[PDB]
Design a protein around this nucleic acid. Structure first.
Ligand SMILES: Nc1ncnc2c1ncn2[C@@H]1O[C@H](CSCC[C@H](N)C(=O)O)[C@@H](O)[C@H]1O
Length: 327
DNA sequence: CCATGCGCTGAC
DNA sequence: GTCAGCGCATGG
């Protein structure tokens, strides 16, 4: 993450829904805001959140009375993507997991915060020929909010990971905000090779497979693109090997293969997967965030999370526009 | 719970 | 053609 000097959101309040690791919370506090409610139902994620933050989130959002929820200015939410991802079966609103959106709509109708901040995957902008996206725009409008949505790639905001996601910012109409803008892109100056741990700490992750088929040569100079070097097996998800002189592929939560969830990389002569701490870094997490003791649960957790740095750039802009009140 | 082999979709 | 994906489905 990046350090913010102008704490533009001092004094405002927010809630962390579908918390996971608390990425939306690290980002929003670096700007001065206060968290007054969190919700997340997974046992293991509740263990890490409490360990880093010291409070335990409520559970199941579907059986919580929206009238118990504390007053708040900003509502934050990265909802489940499985029923929208380009990796699954694409069932959408018909899926038991693809309806969580209407629970946010319930909370919003009763509490009416100043701002609504949501995140989801790339395919969500196109799914169902764009109808799925239009159901969200039209609902937020009916509730009396404006609607801003864009796809941003992390490699354009300083982190070397090819992660494309859709971000949705919404403002209540009596505030008359007319100058919100998405942050502007810049050049990448950090590559995968600059974030790895010493060879003595990742030796147990080294993999010597005999069906290794190198299909490209190691590159000489750094490039802000994923450069594939080889394959194992048939070369499906989890069997592709990449160069450390470029950028990392998207981490996932339920992925498989011999190099499950992180991808394989050619490091100092041998192919291996990424360590949890290295996963933290490619997502923008500080070295002081304490990871879960179960390696398995940690990989899953970083797979479902958001890149802190990108959230930090967006939150400053939300603040700049809210603080512009001339005579 | 944990690991690993898929086999299809989308955006060029 | 070419390549990448906050995943699915079965085994102990
Ligand atoms: N019904 C529900 N009630 C509470 N939490 C739920 C839920 N349904 C799904 N979740 C949680 O929804 C989360 C979505 S991904 C959240 C990641 C978060 N943005 C980050 O910074 O970590 C998952 O962790 C899942 O465990």
């Amino acid at each position: 993450m990046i350090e913010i000097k102008d704490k533009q959101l001092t004094g405002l309040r927010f809630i962390d829904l579908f918390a996971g690791l608390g990425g939306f919370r690290l980002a929003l506090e670096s700007c001065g805001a206060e968290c007054v409610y969190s919700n997340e139902w997974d046992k293991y994620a509740q263990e890490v959140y409490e360990m880093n933050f010291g409070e335990k989130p409520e559970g199941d959002i579907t059986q919580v009375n929206e009238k118990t929820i504390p007053d708040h200015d900003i509502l934050c939410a990265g909802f489940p993507c499985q029923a929208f991802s380009i990796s699954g079966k694409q069932k959408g609103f018909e899926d038991s997991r693809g309806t969580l959106f209407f629970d946010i709509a319930r909370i919003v109708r009763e509490k009416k915060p100043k701002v609504v901040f949501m995140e989801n995957v790339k395919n969500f902008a196109s799914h169902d020929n764009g109808n799925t996206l239009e159901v969200v725009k039209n609902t937020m409008n009916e509730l009396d909010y404006s609607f801003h949505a864009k796809v941003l790639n992390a490699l354009d905001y300083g982190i070397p990971q090819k992660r494309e996601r859709i971000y949705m910012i919404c403002f209540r109409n009596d505030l008359n905000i007319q100058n919100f803008q998405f942050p502007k892109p810049f050049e990448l100056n950090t590559f995968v090779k600059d974030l790895l741990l010493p060879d003595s700490e990742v030796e147990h992750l080294v993999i010597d497979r005999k069906d290794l088929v190198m299909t490209n040569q190691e590159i000489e100079q750094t490039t802000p693109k994923t450069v594939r070097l080889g394959i194992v097996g048939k070369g499906g998800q989890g069997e592709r090997i990449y160069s450390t002189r470029g950028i990392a592929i998207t981490l996932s939560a339920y992925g498989g293969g011999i190099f499950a969830k992180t991808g394989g990389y050619l490091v100092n002569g041998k192919t291996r997967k990424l360590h949890p701490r290295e996963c933290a870094r490619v997502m923008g997490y500080p070295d002081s965030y304490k990871v879960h003791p179960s390696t398995s649960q940690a990989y899953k957790q970083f797979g479902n999370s958001v890149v802190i740095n990108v959230l930090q750039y967006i939150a400053y802009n939300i603040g700049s526009s809210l603080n512009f009140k001339p005579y």
